[PDB]
Amino acid sequence: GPSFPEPKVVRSQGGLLSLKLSATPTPLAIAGQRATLLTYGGSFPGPTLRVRPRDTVRLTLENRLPEPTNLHWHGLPISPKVDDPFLEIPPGESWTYEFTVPKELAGTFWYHPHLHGRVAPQLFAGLLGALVVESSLDAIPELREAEEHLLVLKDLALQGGRPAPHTPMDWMNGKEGDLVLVNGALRPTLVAQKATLRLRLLNASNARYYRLALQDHPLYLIAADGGFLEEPLEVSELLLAPGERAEVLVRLRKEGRFLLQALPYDRGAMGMMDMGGMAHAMPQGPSRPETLLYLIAPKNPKPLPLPKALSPFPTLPAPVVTRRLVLTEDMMAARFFINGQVFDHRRVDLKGQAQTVEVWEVENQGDMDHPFHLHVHPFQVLSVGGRPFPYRAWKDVVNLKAGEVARLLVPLREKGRTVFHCHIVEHEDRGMMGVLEVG
C-alpha cells in the first residue's frame, strides 16, 4: 500500500453520510504483531468520516462488545440530545445518531466511547476514529496545493495479544503504552511528494502527551481543536494533550530525512518508591523521547507561500457570568474532584442560559497536568497561567499544568444537559466530571 498508512475515509454522498459501524473485538496485525483490539468498522483507528457543513450524518452504532458503550462526537457543537453522554447502548443493541453538521464549522474532530466508568479501557483498547469537516477555505491555493495527511497519535500496550489491563497506578496516572503509534503504525515513513504538507494532528491517547517537534523545521499552526486560527502562527514545537487536535503546515526546507518526535515532557505522573522508611509517591519525571515518524523531503523542495489570512474569529457578546472550577486530586485513592465533588449523573453543577457568553476560570490545584474538556460548547482560551493566548480559535480541550488558571470565553449554544471533565479519561472514570445544564 501507500508508504504512509492512514485510516480509510468515508465521505458524505449527496449531503448524507449514512453508515453502520460495529464496535467489535477484532483480530488485527498491528506493529508487526497479531492482536485482538476493540475497533469500530474493523480497523484501528476506526474509519475517518469526512463531511461538509450542513451535511446530514446518520450513524448507526451496533454494540458487539460484552459491555455497554456509547459515542461522544468530540468537539462537535451539536445537541446533547444527540451527543448524549448519559446514553447506554447495551451489548447486542444498536442506536442511530442523526445530526446536521453546523454551518459555521471546520476542522478535525473525533469519536470515541463516553460511558462513565468504562471509557479508559474501551478507548485504550482501540475504539476511536477521526471526523473531518471540510471547509471552503480548503480551496485557497496555499492549502489546496499542500499535501494533506491525518496523524492519529495513540499509544498502546499489549499483553497476551490483547490490550494490557489497567493497574491501580494506571487509574491514578492515566495509562500510557510502550507502542507509540501513528495511525496504528509503528514509526511509519512519510515520503513527501510536495514541499508543503498540511498535517491534521489528533491525540487520541488515554493520557500520553506529545510535545511535537520536527527536526530542523518550525510548524505553522493553522487550526486548533475546533476551527481555524485567524492567520498562521509559527511555533518551534507544539504540545498536544489528550483529546486535542491541531492542523499545521510544514514547509520542507531541503532534501533529506527529518524525524517528527515527541520530545520529553513531564505531565506529573507519579510512581512509588521505598528507600527505608516509605513507601512514598515520587515523580516519574519527563517522558522518554519518541520518534513518531520519518519524514522524507522531495528533491529541491520549493514550498508554497503561507496563506496570509485564514478565518476571522467571531466577535462575541459581552459575558454575563464568571464561573470558577477548581481541580484537585487524591492520588493515593485515585480520586479526582471538581470544586471538591466527584461526578454524579443526577446532580446539575452549573446552570447557564443558551446564547449567552460565560467566562470560565478553571484552576488546577493538583500536581499533574489536567486537560479540561467541555462537551457541546466550544470555547475561546483567553489566557493560561496568566499568559495571554497567542491566537484566537475555537478549542474544546485546554491543558492546565499544576497551579495554572485557564480563563475561557464560553458561548453557550445548544440547550440541554451535558458534561465537562478531564480528558485523561482514567480521571473522568474516577470522578473528575461535572454536569452543565443549558436552558
Please state, in angstroms and rounded to a whole number, the distance separating the CA atoms of residues 141 and 129: 28
Cell of 116: 462513565
Report which secondary-structure segment, H or E, holds 302.
none
Does the annotation list 345 as a binding residue?
no
> What is the rounded CA–CA span in Å between residue 97 and residue 93?
13
Distance CA 315, CA 394 (A): 12
Binding at 234: pick from Na ion, Cu ion, a copy of itself, none (beta carbon under 5-8 Å per type)? a copy of itself
Among 299, 308, 346, 387, binds a copy of itself (CB under 8 A): 308
Residues binding Na ion (CB under 5 A) = 22, 24, 42
- Asked if 387 is part of the footprint of a copy of itself (rule: CB under 8 A), the reply reads no
Instruction: Choose from Na ion, Cu ion, a copy of itself, none: what does 308 bind? Cβ within 5-8 Å by kind.
Output: a copy of itself
Sole binder of Cu ion in the list 35, 269, 406, 424 (CB under 5 A)? 424
Nearer to Cu ion, 99 or 294 (CB): 99
Choose the one of a copy of itself, Na ion, Cu ion, none that binds residue 250, judging by a C-beta under 5 to 8 angstroms depending on kind.
none
427 marked among binding-site residues: yes
Q: Which DSSP string corresponds to 371-387?
A: EEEESS--EEEEEETTE
In the complex, minimum distance from the CB of residue 238 to a copy of itself, in angstroms, rounded to a whole number:
16
Q: How near is the Cβ of 305 to a copy of itself at its closest, in Å?
A: 7
| Least distance CB 361 / Na ion (angstroms) | 44
Question: Which among 36, 371, 339, 329 is positioned nearest to 205, based on CA atoms?
Answer: 371
The alpha carbon torsion through 146, 2, 33, 171 (nearest 10 deg) reads 20
Residue 231 contacts a copy of itself per CB under 8 A: yes
Q: Following DSSP, what letter does each residue of 84-102 receive, concatenated?
A: -TT--B-TT-EEEEEEEPP
The response to whether 377 counts as a known ligand-binding position is no
Nearer to a copy of itself, 283 or 388 (CB): 388
Cell representation of residue 110: 473525533
Choose from Na ion, a copy of itself, Cu ion, none: what does 231 bind? Cβ within 5-8 Å by kind.
Answer: a copy of itself
Comparing CB distances to Cu ion, the nearer of 253 and 413 is 413
Q: Is 217 annotated as a binding residue?
A: no
Q: State the Cα–Cα distance between residues 123 and 204, nearest whole angstrom.
A: 8
Report the partner that residue 24 touches, choosing among a copy of itself, Cu ion, Na ion, none (CB closer than 5 to 8 A by kind): Na ion
Near a copy of itself by CB under 8 A: residue from 32, 276, 305, 386: 305
Binding mask 114-143 for Cu ion (x = CB under 5 A): x-----------------------------
Residue indicated by cell numbers 474538556 = 373
Closest separation in Å from C-beta 251 to a copy of itself: 9
Question: C-alpha cell of 407?
Answer: 480563563
367-386 positions binding Cu ion, by CB under 5 A: 370
- Cβ-contact 426, 370 below 8 angstroms: no
The answer to whether 325 and 434 are in contact (CB under 8 A) is: yes
Is 122 within 8 Å of 115 (Cβ atoms)?
A: yes
3-state secondary structure of 152: strand
Question: Cβ(352)–Cβ(436) under 8 Å?
Answer: yes
Q: What are 220's strand-pairing partners?
A: 234, 249
Q: Is 267 in the site for Cu ion (CB under 5 A)?
A: no
Count the residues of the shown chain that bind Cu ion, applying the rule CB under 5 A.
7
Is 422 labelled as part of a ligand binding site?
A: yes
Instruction: Please report, for the chain, how many H helices and E strands are present, in that order.
Output: 4, 37
Minimal distance, residue 329 CB to Cu ion, in Å: 8
Q: 114-133 b/e with 16+ CB inside 10 Å = b? A: bbbebbbbbbbbbbbbbbbb
Question: Which residues fall within 8 angstroms of residue 32, CB to CB, at 6 or more apart?
Answer: 186
Which C-beta is closer to Na ion: that of 22 or that of 356?
Answer: 22
Q: Which three cell numbers stand for residue 47?
A: 474509519
Is the CB of 308 or the CB of 387 nearer to a copy of itself? 308
Query: Residue 245 touches which of a copy of itself, Cu ion, Na ion, none (CB < 5 to 8 A by kind)?
Result: none
Of these partners, Na ion, Cu ion, a copy of itself, none, which one is at the site of residue 22 (CB under 5 to 8 Å by kind)?
Na ion
Q: Select from 234, 271, 278, 355 the one that contacts a copy of itself (CB under 8 A).
A: 234
Output 41 or 434, the one with its CB closest to Cu ion. 434
Kindly identify the residues of this chain, within the stretch 157-196, that bind a copy of itself according to CB under 8 A. Answer: none
Instruction: Compare residues 42 and 301 and give the one whose CB is closer to Na ion.
Output: 42
Instruction: Tell me the one-letter amino acid at 411.
Output: P
Give 3-state DSSP helix, strand, coil % of the chain, rounded to 5: 5, 50, 45
Positions that interact with Cu ion (CB under 5 A): 74, 114, 243, 370, 422, 424, 427
Positions that interact with a copy of itself (CB under 8 A): 231, 234, 305, 308
Residue ranges at the known binding site for Cu(2+):
74, 112, 114, 370, 375, 421-423, 427
